[PDB]
Amino acid sequence: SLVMSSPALPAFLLCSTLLVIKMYVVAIITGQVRLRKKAFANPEDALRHGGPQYCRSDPDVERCLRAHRNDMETIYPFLFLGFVYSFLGPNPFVAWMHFLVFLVGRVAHTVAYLGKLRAPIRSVTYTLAQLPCASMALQILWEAARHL
Amino acid sequence: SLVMSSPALPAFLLCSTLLVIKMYVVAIITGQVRLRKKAFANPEDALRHGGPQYCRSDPDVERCLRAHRNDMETIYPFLFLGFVYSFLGPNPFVAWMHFLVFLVGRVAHTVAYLGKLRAPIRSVTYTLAQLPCASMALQILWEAARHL
Amino acid sequence: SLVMSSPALPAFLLCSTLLVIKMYVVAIITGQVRLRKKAFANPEDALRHGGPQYCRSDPDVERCLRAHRNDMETIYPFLFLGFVYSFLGPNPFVAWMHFLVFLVGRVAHTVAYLGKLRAPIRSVTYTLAQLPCASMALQILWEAARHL
Ligand SMILES: Cc1cccc2ccc(N3CC[C@H](C(=O)N[C@H]4CCO[C@H](CO)C4)C(C)(C)C3)nc12
Ligand SMILES: Cc1cccc2ccc(N3CC[C@H](C(=O)N[C@H]4CCO[C@H](CO)C4)C(C)(C)C3)nc12
Ligand SMILES: Cc1cccc2ccc(N3CC[C@H](C(=O)N[C@H]4CCO[C@H](CO)C4)C(C)(C)C3)nc12
Ligand SMILES: CCCCCCCCO[C@@H]1O[C@H](CO)[C@@H](O)[C@H](O)[C@H]1O
Ligand SMILES: CCCCCCCCO[C@@H]1O[C@H](CO)[C@@H](O)[C@H](O)[C@H]1O
Ligand SMILES: CCCCCCCCO[C@@H]1O[C@H](CO)[C@@H](O)[C@H](O)[C@H]1O
Ligand SMILES: CCCCCCCCO[C@@H]1O[C@H](CO)[C@@H](O)[C@H](O)[C@H]1O
Ligand SMILES: CCCCCCCCO[C@@H]1O[C@H](CO)[C@@H](O)[C@H](O)[C@H]1O
Ligand SMILES: CCCCCCCCO[C@@H]1O[C@H](CO)[C@@H](O)[C@H](O)[C@H]1O
Ligand SMILES: N[C@@H](CCC(=O)N[C@@H](CS)C(=O)NCC(=O)O)C(=O)O
Ligand SMILES: N[C@@H](CCC(=O)N[C@@H](CS)C(=O)NCC(=O)O)C(=O)O
Ligand SMILES: N[C@@H](CCC(=O)N[C@@H](CS)C(=O)NCC(=O)O)C(=O)O
C-alpha cells in the first residue's frame, strides 16, 4: 500500500481523517441546532419548517458557525503542512507528537467552543494546536528554500 | 505523466478541478451581484461606485456568500479525501462513482442554493454529496490505522 | 529528499508555506484587533476582558475576518492546484512565474485590504493573483481529461 510511502504518513492520515470527521460532526450539530431552535438561514427552509419568521439568526447557530469557521482557518492548513512534512523524513516519534498535539488541541477547541467553557480555555487549546503547525511550516520553509 | 500514478487519479483530478472552477464561478457571481445591487462590503468600494450609502448588506449577496462558505465546508475536505483515496487502490468504477456523485451533488447544491429552489432540494443535494465523502473517510481510517 | 520529486516543487512549497504563514499573520492580527478594540465574539471572552458589553462587533475586526475569508476562498484552491501542477512537468521558469504572481498578488491583497487602500487596488491584486490559478486549473483539466 502507498500509505507506507513514508514512516510518518499513516499517523498523519489517521489524525487528518479524524479531524475531517470532526468538522463533519460540527456541520451536523449546526443543522440540529437550526432545527431545534428553528433558526434557518433561508426563507425556503423556514417556510417548510413553520413559517417565514423562522428565517432568523440564533446565538447558538452563530457559535456553531464560528467553531466551523475556526476549523477551516486551522485544520485546512494542517492538511497541507502535515502531508508535506510527512515526506521530509522527520523522526517518527517527533512527527507523531506534532500530529497528536494538533488532533488533541483541535478536538479540545471544539469542546471548549461549543461547550461555552470559561476563558481562556478555548484560546489556550487554539494556541497549543497551532504550535506544531508553526513548527512544520518552518521545517518546510528550510527544506524548500535549500532545494531552490 | 504522473497523472497515471493510480488508475483513479485522472478521474479525481478532473472532478476536483471542475469543482474548484465551480467555486471560482460563485466568487465571480458574488462580485456581479455586489455591483448590480450596489451592495459592497467596504467603504472604499462603495465610494468608487456611487457613495457611502452603498456599503451595505444585501440578501442575494449574503446568499452567494453562504453558498461559497458551504463549498469551503465540503469541497476542501473532498480535495484531501479524494486525493488520498485515489492511492488506496480502489475499484476504478467504484472510485469514479464516488467522485461523480460528489461532483453532481455539489453542482446541484449551488444551483439549488443560488436558484432559491424549494426545500428540501438543497438539503438533499448536500446529503447526497456527503455520502461518498463519508465512505472515503472511513476507508482511509481503516487503511491508515492498519499501517500504524 | 522528496522535495525534488519535480523541478517546480521546491518553488511551489516555498510560496505555499509563506502563504500559509501569511494567513496565520492575519489570524494573529485579528486577535490583536479584538483585544485592542475590546470586540469579542463570545460572552465568555468579554467577561474576562472587562464585561458583557464587550461581546460586540467592530468594523476593523469584521475587515480582518473578510481578508481571512478571502484568503480561504483563494489560497486553499492554490494549495491544491499548485501541488498537482508541479507534477505536470511545466517549464521551470513558467511555473515559478505562476507561483510568484500568486504569492505577490495575495500578499498585496492583504496589504490593500487591511490597509484600507483606495479602490480598485484590492480588486486588481485579487484579479492578478487569480490569473495563474485559472491557468493551472485549465492545464490540469486537459492533462486529467486526456488520461481518462
Ligand atoms: C457533514 C456530513 C457528513 C456525512 C454525511 C452527512 C449527511 C448529512 C449532512 N447534513 C448536514 C446537516 C443538515 C441539517 O441538519 N440541516 C437542517 C437545517 C435545514 O433543513 C434541513 C431539512 O429539514 C435540516 C442535513 C442533515 C440536511 C445534511 N451532513 C453530513
Ligand atoms: C474567481 C476568479 C477566478 C479566475 C479569474 C478571476 C478574475 C477576477 C475575479 N474577480 C472576482 C469578482 C470581482 C468583482 O466582481 N468584484 C466587484 C465588487 C467590488 O468592486 C469590483 C470593482 O468594481 C467589482 C472581480 C471581477 C474584481 C475579481 N475572480 C476570478
Ligand atoms: C495563527 C497562529 C499560528 C502560530 C501560532 C499561533 C499562536 C497563537 C495564535 N493565536 C491567534 C490569536 C489569539 C488572540 O489574540 N485572541 C485574543 C482574543 C480572545 O481572547 C484572547 C485571550 O485574551 C486574545 C491567540 C493569541 C489567543 C491565539 N495564533 C497562532
Ligand atoms: C466534536 C464535537 C464536540 C461537541 C462538544 C459539545 C459540548 C457540549 O457541552 C454542553 O454545552 C452546553 C452549552 O453549549 C452546556 O450547557 C452543557 O452543560 C454541556 O454538556
Ligand atoms: C510565537 C511562537 C510560535 C512559534 C513556534 C515555533 C516552533 C519551533 O519549530 C522549530 O523551529 C526550528 C527553527 O526553525 C526548527 O529547527 C525545528 O525543526 C522546529 O521544530
Ligand atoms: C455554478 C453556478 C450555478 C449558478 C446557478 C444560478 C441559478 C439561477 O437561477 C435563477 O434563480 C433566480 C433566483 O435566484 C430565479 O428568479 C430564476 O428563475 C432562476 O433562473
Ligand atoms: C449517516 C450515514 C452516512 C454514512 C455513510 C456510510 C458510508 C459507507 O462507507 C463504507 O463503509 C464501509 C465500512 O467502513 C466500508 O467497508 C466501505 O468501503 C465504505 O464504502
Ligand atoms: C500580511 C499582513 C499584512 C498587514 C498589512 C497591514 C497594513 C496596515 O497599514 C495601515 O493601515 C491603516 C488602516 O487600516 C492606516 O491608517 C495606516 O496608515 C497604515 O499604515
Ligand atoms: C477571465 C480571464 C481569466 C482566465 C485566464 C486564462 C489563463 C490562460 O491559461 C492558459 O490556457 C491555455 C488554454 O487552455 C493553455 O494552453 C495554457 O497552458 C494556460 O496557461
Ligand atoms: N478568526 C479568528 C482569528 C483568531 C483566532 O483564531 N482566535 C482563536 C483563539 S481566541 C479563536 O478560537 N477564535 C474564535 C473564532 O475564530 O471564532 C477570530 O476571529 O478570533
Ligand atoms: N454551515 C452549515 C452546516 C450544515 C449544512 O451544511 N447544511 C446544508 C444542508 S441544510 C446546507 O446547504 N446549509 C446551508 C449553508 O451552509 O448556508 C449550515 O449553517 O447550514
Ligand atoms: N467573497 C468575495 C467574492 C468576490 C471576490 O473575492 N472579490 C474580491 C475582489 S473585489 C475581494 O477582495 N472581495 C472582498 C471580500 O471577499 O471580502 C466577495 O464577497 O467579494
Crossing angle, helix C59-86 and helix B59-86, to 10 degrees? 30
The experimental technique used to determine this model is: X-ray
Q: Which fold has domain A1-148?
A: Four Helix Bundle (Hemerythrin (Met), subunit A) (1.20.120)
List the one residue out of A98, A122, A93 whose CA is nearest residue A7.
A93
Q: Residue C40 pairs with which residues in a beta bridge?
A: C55
Nearby residues of A48 by Cβ (< 8 Å), 6 or more positions away: B118, B119, B120
Neighbour count for residue C136 (Cβ, 10 Å) = 27
Burial class (CB in 10 A: 0-12, 13-18, 19+), B36: exposed
Asked if B137 and A21 come within 8 Å (Cβ–Cβ), the reply is yes
Q: What whole-number distance in Å separates Cα of residue B100 and Cα of residue B78?
A: 12
Q: Is the dihedral of CA C84, C88, C92, C98 positive or negative?
A: negative
Q: Are B102 and B125 in contact (CB under 8 A)?
A: no
A141 in ligand 5 pocket by Cβ < 6 Å?
A: no
What part of C 17-56 touches B (C-beta under 8 Å)? none
CA-nearest residue to B21 within chain C is C137
SS3 C60: helix
Alpha-carbon Rg for chain B in angstroms: 19
Measured CA distances, C81 to B129, C64, C77 (Å): 22, 26, 6
Atom of ligand 3 nearest to the CA of C49: 23
How distant is the Cα of A49 from the closest Cα of chain B, in angstroms?
9
Q: Are C20 and A77 in contact (CB under 8 A)?
A: yes
The resolution, in Å, is 1.3
Buried b (16+ CB within 10 A) or exposed e, B106-140: bbbbbebbbeeeebebbeebbebbbebbebbbebb
Nearby residues of A95 by Cβ (< 8 Å), 6 or more positions away: A7, A8, A11, A12, A85, A86
